[PDB]
Amino acid sequence: PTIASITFSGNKSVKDDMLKQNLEASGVRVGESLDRTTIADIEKGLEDFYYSVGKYSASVKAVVTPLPRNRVDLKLVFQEGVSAEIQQINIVGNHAFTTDELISHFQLRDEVPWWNVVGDRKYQKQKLAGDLETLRSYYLDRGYARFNIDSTQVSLTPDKKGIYVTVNITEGDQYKLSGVEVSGNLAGHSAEIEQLTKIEPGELYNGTKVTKMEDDIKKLLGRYGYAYPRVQSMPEINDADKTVKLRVNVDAGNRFYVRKIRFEGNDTSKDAVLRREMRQMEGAWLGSDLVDQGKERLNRLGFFETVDTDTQRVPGSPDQVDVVYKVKERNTLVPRGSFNFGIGYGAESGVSFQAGVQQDNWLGTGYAVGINGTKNDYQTYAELSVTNPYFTVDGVSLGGRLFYNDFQADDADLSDYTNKSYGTDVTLGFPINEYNSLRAGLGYVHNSLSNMQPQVAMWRYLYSMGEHPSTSDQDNSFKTDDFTFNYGWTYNKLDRGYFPTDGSRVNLTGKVTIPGSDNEYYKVTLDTATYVPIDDDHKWVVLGRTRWGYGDGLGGKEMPFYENFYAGGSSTVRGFQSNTIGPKAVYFPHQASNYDPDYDYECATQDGAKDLCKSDDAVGGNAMAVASLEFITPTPFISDKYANSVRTSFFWDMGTVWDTNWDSSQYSGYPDYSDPSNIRMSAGIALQWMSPLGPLVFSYAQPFKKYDGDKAEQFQFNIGKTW
Amino acid sequence: CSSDSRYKRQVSGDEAYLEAAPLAELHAPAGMILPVTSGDYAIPVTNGSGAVGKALDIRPPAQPLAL
């Protein structure tokens, strides 16, 4: 009969889908022709599958009920007792090592160490073959050239759950690599191939070393353009000398030419944004390093979730090849790059918003655009950025950004004042090396200030600027015209452009006022992130990040406070209100010339103190140092590293901000900001998920080291930052 | 889901193929031979009477049935 439904029950999550596949191999399927008798016969095949998966104890039963006119509903019930526990891994014939060292390198285990309980000692035959190959590779690496794996045995116990596995091996003796000979048509590149072949004759033979020798010979031949040379390595052995002479036979083949460069999978990214990242040119002799650098540049650009490279010999043509770059695009058709919803969230009982769009899809002229409109604390800040990473295909980028900013000071650690700022920057950036970028820019800013509650740190700048404001008055006004030579420097080398695994990024930003500017100052910023693959495996990573900053006045004007540094946001230092860290805004006593009785404004003398006054408000600092060390791990879930490439991290942050011009001597009665050793710290867990909207970021990190007035928030959440 | 309950046939994107696609031909000057058309990407003759996508129906045909 035909079956309306086939159901499986009792499975302890062990490959339920493959059970349908087993039935398909058995010739039955939902609605397929099978009767009750053949169902019972075929159920044995399910037992066969669970025998193959290691559940030797398993047996299966069938339950079925017909509909009134011979249409069938089927359930399949499973018994899946404990099985496949490797009670031993045994090696016999070994005489060069203690077996415990050998088996410890297996994926399989005999006894899981309590010191670090990782996985479990569960058998799997394919992994047994893999581990046999690892054993052979170990013995050949140690130098036993004649090593042999002989008749490996697998056993299970008269009670079927108990497994143990035996391997017989023969060793001979470890042999010296008495010499290496390379022969064939090398096309004149013998000298460098020899440098690859360079070895001390006293060196012990090593299978891994000869394998890497073949790999690097292939690499060198690829760089010069031999895509598919025949490379052979063959040992010449004498057992009485107990040494191995080594033979390498090479046919360089043809110099392969790249007829076509094909990009596939980019349904929205304009082809130019991939092709201009190429180092290997079309219609030119192939370079394996050139193609690999193209792949690396595509990964580094960050537009593409995956980048895959295939080299295909042109059908029927001897030496021409197509180079195919297959990619999956970031955001999977969600418009305008990653939509930057910026948020202020965490333990803090405060709300802040940022809204923006990013990256690629923008109109009419091939530029890449970024927009941002925000209110943070009681500030209002909006900016528009227009960029073309390739103003001309040679590599020089061009970028111009416009912004407007406003300041209102209803607490949120924002010092009491009213200020407005707007300005622009025009920027150029031209790579100096494949991994270096250098920038020059010109910037213009204007500012107006009012309702200036008197404040020592800012007033240090105002007092030195001239037009010194009158102390104890709540209101003072100031203006500035600004021109700046914006400049920067960058080094960028990263696996992917996101969730990196290897390489480093260094970004240096600095500006100096060109005379005619009112501020007459210079400041320097340094940003650095470094990544390392744990155990040289990129699936497991550790990130080291630091930021540094200084700014001082060239004409003695020090720096305008409104360009001071800050930290506390999740981008810089987790675990604090966005800008609370660092020197605090000490006010003067003042007589509330402009005031509202509804507000307990800081230290208005008619209500507050009649002397210099502390507050939670932060003025940032004219110097900065921030560091972070991070540890990255997986965390399985229905959405995981494989399904969605989610990232989670254990990390420690070190942050500090200090003012170089705090009068440590004169102001002994108040906290001395002049020393950077007032280090803040935080540590904990962080999470990031590349949702179609964009990068979500989640983290809990208690600020376990803290100073006066730092508004802590042990948890913080945000979305975006795109980079 | 939200929509006007129509365009039961067209794609979500631009159906620009209906217009702005004349197959301008290319002519060989005397004394030069142009490269051959090379296979598939030629378009054969067409009836020209069939309707076009703004009116033509893309529902499956009324196949006969039995059971």
Binding site: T2, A4, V30, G31, S33, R71, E264, G265, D267, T268, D271, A272, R275, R276, M281, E282, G283, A284, L333, N361, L363, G364, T392, V393 | S5, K8, R9, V11, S12, G13, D14, Y17, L23, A24, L26, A28, P29, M32, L34, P35, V36, T37, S38, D40, Y41, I43, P44, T46, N47, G50, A51, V52, G53, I58, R59, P60, P61, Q63, L65, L67
Partner: protein
């Protein structure tokens, strides 16, 4: 979702839902009908209905998979012309993704694989079944899709001209002439091969392409 109602009632109500434009529930109902009753003669008709619903419901990968399944089950069938047209239309529709390209920017040089496969399928349709009612619209789509492919090739040639990989430019424009000779894209491209040939000091070849552009300026 749908219980084991008789196949005829399920099909009638699913056809109604198709006419009501209830694409999601229509897809569920035809999927249930196929699952419970794939053996009966309704399978083919259910397969065609599933094909149409997948295409219109914007489930293009599933539409393509169902088309492949139908073609595998029915190498010969009175509606193969329609199913091949559906394959072409699905791969064509896979390109025009969203609004921002609709009002914002041309979408000719993103990826040809979908367009190229759709063009090959439409070529099969028009060549094998010219008398079919779907031939003419298939021909218009073939013309537009070939123009789009030629524009992609031109958009690669322009890049290589800007970078100056002149051998690449010459090779690409020659390939366009080989495959897409009768298009506006190649007519505009030849004035670029004329520059490319000269940049490499290959005077006579540049002169010959100049001869071609002289006549084809019309």
């Amino acid at each position: 979702e749908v219980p084991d109602n008789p196949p005829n009632e399920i099909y009638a109500t699913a056809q109604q839902k198709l006419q009501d434009g209830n694409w999601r529930q229509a897809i569920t109902q035809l999927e249930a009908l196929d699952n419970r009753y794939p053996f009966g003669p309704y399978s083919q008709q259910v397969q065609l209905d599933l094909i149409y619903a997948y295409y219109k419901n914007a489930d293009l990968p599933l539409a393509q998979a169902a088309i492949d399944r139908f073609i595998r089950l029915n190498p010969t069938h009175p509606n193969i012309d329609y199913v091949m047209y559906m394959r072409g239309l699905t791969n064509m529709a896979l390109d025009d993704s969203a609004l921002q390209g609709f009002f914002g920017v041309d979408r000719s040089d993103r990826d040809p694989q979908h367009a190229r496969a759709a063009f090959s399928d439409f070529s099969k349709l028009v060549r094998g079944y010219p008398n079919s009612q779907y031939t003419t619209d298939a021909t218009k789509r073939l013309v537009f899709l070939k123009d789009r492919l030629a524009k992609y090739e031109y958009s690669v040639a322009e890049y290589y001209t800007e970078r100056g990989a002149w051998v690449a430019v010459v090779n690409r424009v020659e390939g366009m002439l080989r495959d897409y000779p009768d298009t506006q894209a190649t007519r505009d491209a030849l004035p670029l091969m004329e520059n490319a040939y000269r940049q490499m000091q290959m005077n006579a070849q540049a002169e010959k392409v100049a001869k071609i552009i002289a006549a084809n300026s019309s």
